[PDB]
Structures are given as C-alpha cells and as structure tokens.
C-alpha cells in the first residue's frame, strides 16, 4: 500500500512494511529472480492482494526499471488474450487495470487481475527477466 498523489510526497503506508521483507529473504533462498519468487508473492498477494497501490512502490522498489518494462509486456497482451477466451465479453476492463482491482465494488477482476498478474511473475525469468542479475 502506497499513496502517490500527481505532484506530492510519496505517502507510503509501512506500520508492518516487515512482511514484504519476508517475501524479501525468500527471493534469496532461490536463484536470482527465478520462479521460486512467484512462491512467496503468490501467498502475499494471493492472501493479503494489496491494492493496485503496492504494485507501485512493489514494482519500483521490490523490481527495478527494467523488469518491471518486460514484467507487464506480459500482462499488455495477456490482457488482449485473457479476455478474448471468454472472462465475461469483458465489462470493467475498459478503463485502465488500476481500476478494475481498485474497485471495491467489481472486485471480480481483482482475484482474476490478481492470477495474471502472478502468470507474469512466475514466467519472468521465462519469458521477462533478467536472471543474470534479477
């Protein structure tokens, strides 16, 4: 959880930013990156999904520039192919994906948006990544 207001200070939001940390010890345990990690971010955002807010400071920080280019590229067009198999002649997407899981109310793209999203975490190193470094 984190608040970026266009033009402000960046409000992060810790009170307990020690549980992104275990998911910090855990990418160690495993080669640099590597599928392992989806593992520990598959619990943490399978369990608690922060809102589209983490991702931002997850991405920036837990990330860096570069994966967090390919990461999505995933995504971009996983989104074009998730919804032509048939998700519901697609409804909330239409605005931008920050919106549909940052809806307390059409929360159905959030468990969804929630499983594509680790389908791009879990195939980084294959497919987006850079485990030479990671």
Not at 36 to 44: C, G, V, Y
Request: proline residues 10%.
């Amino acid at each position: 959880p984190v608040m970026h207001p266009h033009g402000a200070p960046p409000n992060h939001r810790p009170w307990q930013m020690k549980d992104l940390q275990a998911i910090k010890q855990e990418v160690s345990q495993a080669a640099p990156g590597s599928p392992q990690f989806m593992q520990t971010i598959r619990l943490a955002v399978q369990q608690f999904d922060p809102t589209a807010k983490d991702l931002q400071d997850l991405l920036q920080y837990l990330c860096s520039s570069l994966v967090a280019s390919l990461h999505h590229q995933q995504l971009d067009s996983l989104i074009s192919e998730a919804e032509t198999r048939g998700i519901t002649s697609y409804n909330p997407l239409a605005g931008p994906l920050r919106v549909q899981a940052n809806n307390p109310q059409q929360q159905g793209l959030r468990r969804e948006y929630q499983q594509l999203w680790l389908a791009a975490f879990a195939a980084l190193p294959g497919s987006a990544k850079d485990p030479s470094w990671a």
